């Protein structure tokens, strides 16, 4: 089996012949990636519940994280 970082072939952020990211991509999916990237610091990529902070990218990753 292959553990591939996109869903499907047709994502660009991957190697068609690999499967996995290509050269240049960060990332393939995620709240935080844009166009096989992450996307810039404090970007606000979740809506908190409540009042509560809302979620802001890292610019390091392509998860949305959890205000602590």
Known sequence: GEECDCGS?????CDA???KLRPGAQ???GLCCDQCRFKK???????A????PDD???????DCPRWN
């Not at 610091?41 to 809506?47: D, L, M, S």
């Not at 519940?49 to 509560?52: A, I, L, P, V, Y």
């Not at 802001?56 to 392509?62: D, E, H, L, Y």
């Open 49 to 52: 519940r409540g009042d509560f």
């Open 41 to 47: 610091k404090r970007t606000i990529c979740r809506i």
């Open 27 to 29: 990332c393939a999916d």
């Open 56 to 62: 802001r990218c890292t610019g390091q990753s392509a």
């Open 9 to 13: 072939p047709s994502n660009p952020c």
């Open 17 to 19: 012949a690999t499967c």
